[PDB]
């Protein structure tokens, strides 16, 4: 079986974090998960633990009530997170609520199970619009906004930089498909041609991404910008295919939140990602998490089982006498090693902690609306009713960890803002992400001089020169036209269609109207 991160308490809350990577396509049926993950894994687990410690310490939030947890590996895989959710359901101390998981596609698979047992789920990174259906997903909520905004923002970015003929790639799954189809419905309505829409799984082989990159160079040179509604490793695979083929620098990738500022995606293939514009969600680094995490040591921390593996992996050494020692690494772990070296905090850590607080404050509102005087759990919440917990969680009005009031709408979604990033070079051979814009409630603000300072053109046809040249569409696509001139008697009515002057009249010098022949 899989080891779990256990913590006792008067109320145990479930958690699903991607401690390991998705199992290799070879051993998928075996469900043998891949390498350990820090930001989406270990860090989120320790955040769960410490946040529950704080909720216990806090006398205002849930007084006389201890919060325990059962933290299980999601592996960013539907089947693995579903087996572990079954291990949550195994009882029917019961699991009151569930936090996570990461991928919207996996979150649906989990929700489908949890809803049957009235267990409210709160996702930190699942953004898909389909999860806004509360008839399909009654007991689902998320602290991040629907992707109907992020798609609109991506469309607005395409609009601002006068891009019309674009290629479109998305990760095969609910997140990618929902986002891409919303981008299709919005861009096409706003007059943006989609050269071709491509879908690929994140764990597809090298040859598969090579084929994808070749199919992307099929539309070159017209369609250079690639609207990517791709999670992480999909963008990474694209960059690695650009290294393999040599098609680097020829495209411009417009990534979604799957590649917000993730260094694990661009590290090692920096030149290939240069110029890429991506979308992040408004999550300021949670101050007190770094103070807890960076002080952690493998000798001290003994509640996270994977911390031994993760410590041996991040430093690539073997913890000499420790229990879960792995002989693989040729080096031995020194006492000088510390996490502060090359520390990169999880981008969505704020949402993780805010979701844990969402569950806590929902339980507290239910506590006050059922056991007013009794300090702690009374006989009315023995047992805790899941339906009442959902009704109290939807009506939660609290101030978040980022100093911003978190609230939930009718569809169980939370409001959100986005930061637009750019992977440019900050110096010779050095590359890093930089904030270049923002998107909130429709308004898109950008610093246009920071992105290019150099400009890129991704259109299928250059605007017809003013004089008399009309826009005549080609064989198939709208944005593809052939600038054809007008007859001497014809004046240009509108950009698209030409109109002829009647007998005696003749087109004016500006070719906007007619004028009598002298």
């Amino acid at each position, epitope marked *: *079986r*899989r*080891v779990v991160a256990h913590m006792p308490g008067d109320i145990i809350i479930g958690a699903l974090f991607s401690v390991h990577h998705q199992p290799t396509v070879d051993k998928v049926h075996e469900r043998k998960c891949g390498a350990v993950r820090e930001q989406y894994g270990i860090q989120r687990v320790e955040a769960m633990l410490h946040t529950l410690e704080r909720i216990n310490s806090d006398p205002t939030l849930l007084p006389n009530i201890t919060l325990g947890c059962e933290i299980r590996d999601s592996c960013w895989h539907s089947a693995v997170a579903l087996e572990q959710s079954i291990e949550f359901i195994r009882d029917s101390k019961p699991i009151v609520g569930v936090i996570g998981p990461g991928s919207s596609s996996v979150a649906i698979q989990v929700q489908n199970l949890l809803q049957l047992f009235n267990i409210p789920q709160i996702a930190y990174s699942a953004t898909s619009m389909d999860l806004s259906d509360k008839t399909l997903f009654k007991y689902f909520m998320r602290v991040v906004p629907s992707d109907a905004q992020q798609a609109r923002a991506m469309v607005d970015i395409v609009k601002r930089y006068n891009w019309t003929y674009v290629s479109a790639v998305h990760t095969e799954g609910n997140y990618g498909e929902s986002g891409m189809e919303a981008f299709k419905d919005m861009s096409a309505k706003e007059g943006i041609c989609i050269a071709h829409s491509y879908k690929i799984y994140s764990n597809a082989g090298e040859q598969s991404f090579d084929k994808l990159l070749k199919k992307l160079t099929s539309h070159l040179p017209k369609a250079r910008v690639v609207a990517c509604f791709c999670e992480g490793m999909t963008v990474r695979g694209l960059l690695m295919a650009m290294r393999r083929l040599g098609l680097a620098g020829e495209f411009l990738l417009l990534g979604s939140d799957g590649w917000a500022d993730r260094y694990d995606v661009t590290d090692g293939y920096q030149r290939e990602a240069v110029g890429g514009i991506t979308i992040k969600l408004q999550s300021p680094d949670v101050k007190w998490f770094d103070d807890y995490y960076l002080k952690l040591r*493998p*000798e001290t921390n*003994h*509640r996270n*089982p994977w911390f*031994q593996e993760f410590w041996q992996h991040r430093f690539q050494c*073997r913890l*000499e*006498g*420790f*229990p*879960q*020692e*792995n*002989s693989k690494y040729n080096k031995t772990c020194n006492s000088s090693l510390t996490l502060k070296t090359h520390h990169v905090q999880d981008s969505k850590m704020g949402f993780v902690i805010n979701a844990i607080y969402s569950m806590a404050y929902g339980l507290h509102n239910m506590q006050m609306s059922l056991c007013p005087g009794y300090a702690g759990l009374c006989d009315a919440m023995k047992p805790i009713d899941g339906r009442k917990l959902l009704e109290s969680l939807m009506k939660t009005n609290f101030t978040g960890v980022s100093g911003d009031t978190i609230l939930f709408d009718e569809n169980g979604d939370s409001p959100g803002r986005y930061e637009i990033m750019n992977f440019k070079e900050m110096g010779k051979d050095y590359f890093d992400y930089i904030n270049v814009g923002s998107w909130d409630n429709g308004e898109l603000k950008m610093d246009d001089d920071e992105v290019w300072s150099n400009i890129i053109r991704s259109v299928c046809s250059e605007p017809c020169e003013k004089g008399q040249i009309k826009v005549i569409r080609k064989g198939e696509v709208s944005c593809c036209w052939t600038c054809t001139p007008c007859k001497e008697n014809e004046y240009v009515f509108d950009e698209y269609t030409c109109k002829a002057c009647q007998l005696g009249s003749w087109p004016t010098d500006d070719l906007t109207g007619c004028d009598l022949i002298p």
Partner: nanobody
Amino acid sequence: QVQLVESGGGLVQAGGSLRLSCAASGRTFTSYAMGWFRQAPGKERESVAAISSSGGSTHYADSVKGRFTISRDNSKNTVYLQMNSLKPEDTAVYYCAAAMYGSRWPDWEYDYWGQGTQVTVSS
């Protein structure tokens, strides 16, 4: 909730050999490390040998170095301690204990015990 059973002990002559077994109940024995330690009457308890949760990497006390060997078959879900050329100072109650999460052995947090097998080495 894992339960351990010790076996293999008894009584042996001076310089003889004796092999020790310890079996665990339930899965996730592969997730726990294992360490045998002995305790004699009056004397305080001494950590004998230890093997990592994955196996392969082993540690021994200076007293039993070059004399004992600890091993484990995870498929059998069992750990073993072969005590070649025993001495009279080895007479004690040997215990087998599981430890997920420790530090450099002998510093481990043992969070499961076993019954205990009595080993008597006659002069």
